[PDB]
Amino acid sequence: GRVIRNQRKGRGSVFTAHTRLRKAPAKFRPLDYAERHGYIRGIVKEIIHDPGRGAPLARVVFRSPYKYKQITETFIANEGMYTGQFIYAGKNAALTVGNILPLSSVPEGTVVSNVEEKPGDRGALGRTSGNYVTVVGHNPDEGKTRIKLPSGAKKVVPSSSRGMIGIVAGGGRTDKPLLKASRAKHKFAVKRNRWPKTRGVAMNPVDHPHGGGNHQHIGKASTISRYAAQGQKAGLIAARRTGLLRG
Amino acid sequence: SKRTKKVGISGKYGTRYGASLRKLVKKQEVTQHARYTCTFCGKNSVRRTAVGIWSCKSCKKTMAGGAYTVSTPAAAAMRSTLRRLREITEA
Amino acid sequence: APTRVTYRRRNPYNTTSNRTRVIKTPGGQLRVLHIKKRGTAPKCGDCGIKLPGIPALRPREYATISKPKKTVQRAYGGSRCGNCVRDRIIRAFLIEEQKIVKKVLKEQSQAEKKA
Amino acid sequence: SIGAKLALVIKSGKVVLGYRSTLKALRSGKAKLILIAANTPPLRKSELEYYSMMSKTPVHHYSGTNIELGTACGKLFRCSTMAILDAGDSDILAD
Amino acid sequence: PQEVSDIKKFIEICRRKDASSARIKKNPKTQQIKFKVRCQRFLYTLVLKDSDKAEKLKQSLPPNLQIKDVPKRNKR
Amino acid sequence: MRAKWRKKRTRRLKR
RNA sequence: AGGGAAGUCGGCAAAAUAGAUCCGUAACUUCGGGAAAAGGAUUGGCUCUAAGGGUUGGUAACAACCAACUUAGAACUGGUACGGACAGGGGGAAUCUGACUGUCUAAUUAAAACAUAGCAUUGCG
RNA sequence: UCGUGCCCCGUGUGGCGAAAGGGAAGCCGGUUAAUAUUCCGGCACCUGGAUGUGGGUUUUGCGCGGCAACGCAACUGAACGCGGAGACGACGGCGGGGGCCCCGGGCAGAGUUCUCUUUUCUUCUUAACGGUCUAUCACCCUGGAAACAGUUUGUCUGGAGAU
RNA sequence: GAAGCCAGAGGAAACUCUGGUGGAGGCUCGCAGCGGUUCUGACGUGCAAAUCGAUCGUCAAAUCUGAGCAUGGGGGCGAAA
Ligand SMILES: [Zn+2]
Ligand SMILES: [Zn+2]
User: Fold this and answer.
1) d(Cα D51, Cα D57) in Å, to the nearest integer?
2) In this structure, which residues have their CB less than 5 angstroms from ion ligand 1?
3) Which residues of C make up each annotated binding site?
4) B32 contacts B52 by C-beta, under 8 angstroms
5) Bridge partner residues of E24 (DSSP)
6) What are the backbone angles phi and psi of residue B74, rounded to the nearest 5°?
7) At what angle do helices E53-60 and E7-15 cross, to 10 degrees?
8) In this structure, which of A14, A62, A208, C69 has its CB flanked by the most CB atoms within 10 Å?
9) Is B82 in contact with A49 (Cβ distance < 8 A)?
10) How far from the centroid of its chain's Cα atoms is residue A6's Cα?
């Protein structure tokens, strides 16, 4: 046979992500003395729409403590942030929406966003619209913090990891149906070349493992092993259960 | 003089996409295109600019809110429990 | 009466820079004239409205005209509008006075704590 | 309450509604009490507090918005700040 | 091209060194007379009503500045 | 204005 | 010419309808549509009438000046024909089928094929 | 004398890539067998470089006026920063301007003219570059509005100050 | 002829009806353009190694299109033939 679409997506070429309309990556300030020991104030000047991202971004300008310069940063906006608002990033910052605090300085039950997996990677968890990470446990002796992710997972991260207090703006985006095909086309033409998608059962045996036959059918179980060969993975991969659950 | 008995703002969609899907999308379309009272100036001039972005025409203030609503009940409960935790931590 | 016209440059496409207007010459010939793009007014760096008193030109055309025509005789003149300058003055004065009152109250509280 | 006393002031005494009229009353030194709504812009709020500090005039911070302040004054428009010039029959000055 | 509305300014422009030529346009349908002086950058013109002040000003130009009355036809 | 024009002015002064 | 599908595997092809104004329009239906449904009455020319406006000027509800295109009504009149050429829906009763708009086998197959929204499942902190 | 030395800033440190993207500046008339916004004539503009005159400022050293929006021929401004312009989708109606189309009178010319037709047709033009007077939005001063008012084809504006 | 808006008649209100305004829709007739349904079509060593005529589908968008660039054969690309 030939190289499948799944294998061809990893070479780059037409399958790379869109770049032009997307201005700056959304991440926290680098961890420094001001955030590690006290707090630093920044001014939220713009709330912008990121093409390809459902969550609005916030352009916030801070001051350089070491030189005479204004530093602009791009944060993921939480629901309630407005232009002209002073946000405070640091250890001694207050528990206000938009403030960035380490997880050791927040109480349990606090919901945070753009949470760092490791102190210094400028935010990894809970970054999409309407999502949040819940601070569910603390361990001061080991310096650890248990958090709950939007997938239902619970994870343990170092307590020096930072997170913006609040819930990411743009919630309920997926509730509205994308009535027309053009709406999905516009949604994916700003992200990457993955739309429209052709079913493998409508293909030829040269094109995909599901192709061929006088009737359109899979021909075997749709669950495929984890250690399958490259190109043998097409369908449900390493599934522990299948079917519709009653709940 | 009401022109459509039931579809309302979904009347632009014709007979297409299904009655239930038109009924579902009617709520987000109405809530999205409605005008809102500003928290900062009190004028009925807050309208959606992009998804999650709500700008006021009078005072020129831009807020981050829900996708089709100016605020979400999850964010309101977040504010409530957040001020709860602020009060507990402070005193 | 020839009323139909041609371009005068070798660009045949109706692009943004290929802008023309129709004139009638003193020889009684209906011709085109290639014109430049319209200049836009400078805007306030705080609120974004058009600054009054400053002409709307192309970026390099500003270097050919004098300084009083490119600015307004005021602090932040030709860069910010008058309302924004007034708000800056009021905000600066009020925040400095608040800092003085806060420092006096902090010194009084520190003296009371020490005593 | 504060709304009832405000309505008594409207029906009995004299007031000025608005930022510019409040500034004129504060400059004239005839303002007896300055009411500032919650949703007043903070620069205007601090400026009016500074003017009242200069004029030795009490400031009441109304917890409602300018819609609610106009409604309490009995008007169908918004009012961010206001000044009273005569208390009338109300007991609004001693509080 | 520039128009000067002052006789003394036209005189100073004529005494300027860059002035290489002066010429006179007589419009009888309009009843006016134009004195045009060619400087390096600008052609300066003065418009007058038909009177003896035109000939007085003609005398008032310097003799080094050569002056011509324009013809009826601009033949090459 | 621009550094080249300012340099022209200060070079005229220096000359 | 008369007949009007008797022709033919099969109404293939041709004919028939057609613009605009007015009367009127069923089943079904996701109430949005169907719908230009269906089925009817009219249209030339000429001579008139009526209505729909602007500028300036101390009951001005009035004077003066100026202006162009629509709309309605009436009389008269030619006739074999009046959207006089051109231009321009045939319609209806049902059944199967794909939801629709869209896309493909350049050079024999445009489709119940593909895609689509919606639905569900899987792996990953 | 300098070609030699002394400082200062140092976070960052290449090139190619569009005759439809961004971009400093030229119009008119005439001219050849064949070129012309390129030649010729007239009238301008931009960029870079020097360098004077007039005018301006200054013994209150680096202008004056207007309440203000701001104005005027000038009217010091290094390092380091801030901001604007460059610099921006598609569609719908509305309003202004140029050009084209249509109607009337007048001069000149051409055609029709059995009859009719004060007739039908043709020329009646004004560039770049400047001066001056104006041009939607917006902004400023007075003033404080419900018997709510202003106002668009389209319902927005106003005690955060409308008419 | 969808939201939004105006007026009138009701209704205690909410709302109901009527007349307007407005100009939405991967709506529709249809010119260009794009495409290629049908004809015992023309043509069949043709004008043409895929053309010509009538007819037909679509026509404000998942529409048409240029230039620069990217993907190169045990590969690519594929609304999938
Ligand atoms: Zn506001
Ligand atoms: Zn401003």
Assistant:
1) 8
2) B 38, 40-41, 56, 58-59
3) 44, 46-47, 81, 84
4) no
5) E35, E69
6) -60, -40
7) 30
8) A208
9) no
10) 22
